[PDB]
Amino acid sequence: SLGNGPILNVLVVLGVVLLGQFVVRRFFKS
Numbered sequence: 001s002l003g004n005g006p007i008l009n010v011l012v013v014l015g016v017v018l019l020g021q022f023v024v025r026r027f028f029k030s
Helices: 007-029
Strands: none
Touching: none
């Protein structure tokens, strides 16, 4: 939201991606 500050969109996308990668790798480890 707010074109002046579009950084919010970046933060949310990054969070989702990180969570997915972490959980998948952890399961494989065990």
